Amino acid sequence: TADFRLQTSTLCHSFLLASANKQDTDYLTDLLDNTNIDLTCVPNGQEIIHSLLQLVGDFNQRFSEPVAQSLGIDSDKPVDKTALEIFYLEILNGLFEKLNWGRIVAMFAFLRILVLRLSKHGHSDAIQMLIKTTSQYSDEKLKNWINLHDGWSGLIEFSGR
């Protein structure tokens, strides 16, 4: 088994890559290193990724640019990694006023939108910062709750699979 921070980064990388294969064009597989990521380290990791993909898709349909436009995530220009982090962390600090599995699904959904828009151009460093930022934020704020809910494995029963 692995520490929660490593389990959360491993699960963030596999959900982002799997979501990219879903896209008409996948840019992420080439621009990210999948050599040191093993979902096998995460307990029940495959079903967690399948569960998170089912839940994030239902979320994307239900809920459909103010700061993305400011941060130029859709630009070819190198981005401000420092500013996107404060904005992402603050956006997450607002989301987790209430802590439920549904709010966790939304955080992964936001990371998917930011990572997939960033991927069109090779902003690998920003995507990696965001994956690390999700991992650090989850270890600090979401870990006690995620732990008291069967862990990341809790998403498997929440999904209904």
Ligand X SMILES: CN(C)CC[C@H](CSc1ccccc1)Nc1ccc(S(=O)(=O)NC(=O)c2ccc(N3CCN(Cc4ccccc4-c4ccc(Cl)cc4)CC3)cc2)cc1[N+](=O)[O-]
Footprint of ligand X on this chain (CB under 6 A)?
55, 58-59, 62-63, 91, 94-95, 100-103, 105-106, 109-110, 113
Q: Give min distance, CB of 36 to ligand X, in A.
A: 28
In this complex, which beta carbon is closest to ligand X, that of residue 37 or of residue 91?
A: 91
In this complex, which beta carbon is closest to ligand X, that of residue 79 or of residue 95?
A: 95
Alpha carbons 26 and 22: distance in angstroms, whole number: 8
Q: Give min distance, CB of 56 to ligand X, in A.
A: 8
Cα angle: 91, vertex 95, 97; to 5 degrees: 120
Using CB positions, name the residue nearest to ligand X.
102
Q: What is the DSSP letter of 41?
A: G
Q: Give min distance, CB of 105 to ligand X, in A.
A: 4
Sign of CA dihedral 146, 147, 149, 151: positive
In this complex, which beta carbon is closest to ligand X, that of residue 42 or of residue 116?
A: 116
| 82-85 own/partner pairs: CB under 8 Å, 24+ apart | 84/114, 84/126, 84/129, 84/130, 85/129, 85/130, 85/133
Alpha carbons 15 and 39: distance in angstroms, whole number: 10
In this complex, which beta carbon is closest to ligand X, that of residue 63 or of residue 76?
A: 63
Q: Give min distance, CB of 2 to ligand X, in A.
A: 25
Q: Give min distance, CB of 37 to ligand X, in A.
A: 23
In this complex, which beta carbon is closest to ligand X, that of residue 42 or of residue 55?
A: 55
Cβ neighbours of residue 41 under 8 Å, at least 6 residues apart?
1, 2, 6, 7, 10
